[model samples]
Target: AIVVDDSVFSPSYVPKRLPHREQQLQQLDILLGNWLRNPGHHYPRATLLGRPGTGKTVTLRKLWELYKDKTTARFVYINGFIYRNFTAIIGEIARSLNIPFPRRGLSRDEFLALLVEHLRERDLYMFLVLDDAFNLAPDILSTFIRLGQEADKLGAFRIALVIVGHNDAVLNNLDPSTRGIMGKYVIRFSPYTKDQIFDILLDRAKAGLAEGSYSEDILQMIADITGAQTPLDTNRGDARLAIDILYRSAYAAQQNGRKHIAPEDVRKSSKEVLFGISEEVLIGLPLHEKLFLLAIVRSLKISHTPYITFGDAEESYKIVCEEYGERPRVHSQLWSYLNDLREKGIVETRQNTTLISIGTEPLDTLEAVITKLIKEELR
Candidate 1:
């Protein structure tokens, strides 16, 4: 038996090939190159907008890897989701630049002043890559834009900002002048097509696994399953979900002493990977909201329809009330519960001008999965 490293269970595989990101790289190169050539000139900030898995972070990391050592360019990568507050954001930047903060407690203005002074004295060019920017507060966002503007005035170096987010609505929230200056380039990382996802999975399999470890049929099945879901969708032809699925499957096979990854192994691994998803969202939910999800899961099992309109979900929620011997919530409250689920990635919706419908993918049994999740939270 070949001894497998326990560390392999951790997700840390670097791809041999970055699939379907040539256009994004080329555009980013132009922006970086323009700033390099004219350090004194004001460079327009741009956003790399896409869904969760179109490779925004990967693309930025690749750019930093290439340019970090070439000149005085400093790359600051921030995951906005984790650094949710303004102070944390500034602290991260200061730490990256090795700038010491004042010993005494510093206000936001004082921190920004210190940062500006340090950048000016050092004559350094910095690129702030804000990943998952949607999670940041509007006030914090305004401060980030203000920082970029302040750096531009010092005549020390050009500070270009690349904001990455899920949608265009983030751009709309910026100040008008800030939007005009930063609006010169808006690059959208489109989701991966079915063929592209297949290529990504095959490439990852070849690089990550030994020869004949996984069959072509298994890869195709994983691709097809991932392509059917929107949240798991990669608009730029990269199969992010397939990569996760493959890694998890390989780990499962290794644990079970299987030499080759089979279809059932992939299915089990997929469910296991998804099961690790946390329910921090459940902490904020009211008792009725929890019951609302339980009701929806029970209804989906009985009706066998993964997709349901708001009105239909309300009917199921009423049944939940009867089952629990409690009064039913109003329709508005039920709608709020569905919104919370969508926000927490438990459910999704199809939205139009005046209508919205709740739905989930057919990948896993939602009824059993959610019921199990709710029970765990109660404990």
Candidate 2:
């Protein structure tokens, strides 16, 4: 018998209700509630910030889900990392709103013009969410800051901004002019307590796992590890990560055809998901970067070393790629991959003659991925 529903564990899954974020949700409601009643009320722009995994994204997405179809206001979400630039983000919003334009090559100015025009033509309001907003290019956020107030002046379509991020150097990084106007609407999502994480994970288990698939003890163990009171800080109190461990552990049990989640399964799965590279983020990288990481993993694992410099990682990458009948990326491309990894905080680096790998969270997480990939490659 299966232990869990795969859908509930999916990377894109968000619960129908968030477990402990009701207050945050209510605060958001108060900020936007007036706008719902009076779409032209000049809704206050807001900043949603907290340490990673504190439910900022979950709350805003839930708000977006509730309101998207309930009113004429179109709720738009932009992944700051994916769009990465002001022009591209504006274009994405225009596209999402179905503003008319050519198939390609619309300038940023043109995109904004079309976006504002269609918005006004329909008397539509926008609640644009910039998710992972810490990565948003300077212009993208600043432009939107002015966009809302400027529209208020023209009595054009009303637009509201929601910026979601881990921490905010971005607000500080904003040009002084934009910074002055933007920090008024701000909310901080506090880390979940041990009890909060347990209750939340239990809700997920009931929804996603089979009855009796896990026991109260297993749930408690997960909660203790994931709570803010935990000794480690990188993964502290991330409900998503806690739920991820639960799902993964259940899946592992199911794979073994076990009716109950074993204690070993719980320990192993928690370590892999918490301090480990997120399986969701790992699976999305380009082919060569994955290979490059595998090379580093292979190098470190065999040598009983924690980290390898770019030179050794590159050399190992070349050797590993060759064994699999593939060509390795050039030094420049490998360096590019290294930079991306550092940027994403997947791997920690320090300055030497060049960036040198110091270590990674969970330390052995990459080993698991590389082993799986190699078995597939050889077969």
Candidate 3:
């Protein structure tokens, strides 16, 4: 029996306390609190900065939870990636407010006019959290920021923008003035160091797992390597990921009919998780590339040693192509595809010209994945 609170391990779970982000959270809360205290007192705008797994999204959502019911102002999050343009953004905001606007002939201007009018008539203020908002066009973001500014100038119903995203790639999307104001309130969330990740994992495991299911030693085992590396990615020292592996390890224990988790359970589950992730990447490759990789897998399956040269790969590739009744890409293109695979962390290339081989990725794992893909490819 696995003693698992699986919900806690979900990516969606927001903990009561977020570690390492108290200051940032407090700072945002102050701004939001002031705005809530007086709707037109100040339209608070802030941008959260960090790479993936830094808890920007989590921190923002926590603040929303903290204030939603207590304040009259409405809080809603719009994913810039999903609502990539102003039209969709406006439409979503309109619908979220339960406005009964007709879907036909509603241009962007009409939609904006309707929403602003509704907000004003209803005496409603909004706090919009734009997640990964850099994907939204510069003009569109400017318009959102400026919409609130215009309302403030008139001392009427107000809106605040909370911009959240990674580094300069997203930050640079804004104009100098906009980025400058956002920079004034910029809060950078740094990636978790190993110790922090370990502590967080230990914290999570306590609530989510049985007391006997994991030890500090197993927790440390996961912590030391949590974001260390993966076949498809370099770990981000993400606490969520650490918790994910911890949960999976317990599941592995249960599947083996064990009462509690073991060190082997952690190792086994981690290996499978990494392999599964790598295989997902493999599956996403183009048909030609997948076939080429299958060729490499077949070569390894038949080879005495794990390493294989370009000649071997090419020969296998041609055979594979012929078997499928398709012409093989030129040797140069196959070589190029190999380079791409290496860059994607699917396979690694050593410096010397002696042989192309699977350097860091395990041969058996790669073979297992490619074999399945090949079978799937056939079907």
Candidate 4:
């Protein structure tokens, strides 16, 4: 009975309408969009600060949608949590802007110089939006603070930035001088209130669920729990949580052959939204890590036993890296990435044997999900 458009509930989906984010969107237009109006008139910089699920990333995506038609300058988005290294971040920026460069053997300074030369030659301006900015190394962030001036010395205004993070703690980590530059032009995204969350749910429900499948009571209930002011409930006013609850509630109703979602469905669904490995986590991984995980998944899929040897997984990883034209990371880096994966609950390791297996998640499904992400990323 629920004719749901599943894509509407996707974490990465940017709705055409931002229900209560008008002010922040307008601020972005003023702080960053001015660059689009006049090429060299102003190099706009902004810092977007908010809690998770408070619409920090989607707001930037909406801004891109609003201006994509008229803007010639590229808006390059980088997530510091994944591309934490300076060279990886710069290389991603270049790749996004279609600047040609070898994938390996480039030092951070050399890559920065090449990017500067490319921008100077083309007279192109780049709006580099670094999301999860706090995950980046402090020295690298300081370099970004002075990047605009560094390019100015080279006779062009080639870069502007929108630094995004959860809160002012991102600024606290910066050196005083860098903090001074980063603190200016800050835009805050406060958590959504109950009514504000109701509006967000209404919009999402209209797009994702059949009209007769849900009622205002269900939506209000979801919003109330999501926007509750209880001291221990850190997810208060989280739109992502609100939408995810709705999606699951509707799905539960449909799976049980019910014509409409009931209060019981909402209650049952909210208790376990993201209980297992999810595509959202996979989407955040860096290129090599994504490849490495795919390798483990692929190897696990064919194994007659539950676990594969570490050496076999490594062999699979190198082949996958070569297939994607990426240099295989050294063994130590691979070990580090493996430990990170295990910590994230994506994989399991036995105490006595040097063996690995996908944790709880089905191997075939994870393989499909990660492969899809890797293809889209490479493209």
Winning model by TM-score: 4
Candidate 2 C-alpha error for residue 152, in Å: 5.9
lDDT of 3 by residue, 19-104 (tens): 77899899888767878766766668888887677788889889888887788888767988799898788878877787777868
Off by over 4 Å in 1: 1-13, 228-238, 273-379
How far does residue 42 in candidate 1 sit from its true spot (Å)? 2.5
lDDT, residue 81, model 1: 83
Window of ten residues with lowest summed lDDT in model 2: 354-363
Model 2: pairs clashing at backbone N, Cα or C within 3 Å? none
For candidate 3, the lDDT comes to: 0.73
What's the distance in Å from true for residue 182, model 4? 1.9
**How well does each candidate superpose onto the true structure, as a TM-score?**
0.67, 0.69, 0.69, 0.69
Q: List lDDT for all candidates, in order.
A: 0.67, 0.73, 0.73, 0.79
lDDT of 1 by residue, 1-379 (tens): 2123323323344454567887897788888766754564675477888876677777777776666666566788888988889889989999999999778999988888888877788887788888788888766776777667754456644578888888877878877866665676878777766456667778776656777777765666556445434444443234566677777777677778888775446656656545433446554667788778777655545553324456666788898777666789998888787878766655545432212222222324544555555565655
lDDT of 2 by residue, 1-379 (tens): 5454778776677888887789899989988867855677665678887887788887888887787666767788888879878777876887888776777787767766777777777778888888888787777788787777776443653887888776668688899999877686788887787678888888788888888778876676566566665324545777777887778778777888788876446556766755546666776677787788778766655544323567888889999888778888899999899889766656545444543332333335556775565556556
Candidate 2, residue 20: how far the Cα is off, in Å: 2.0
In Å, residue 314's CA in model 1 sits off its true spot by 39
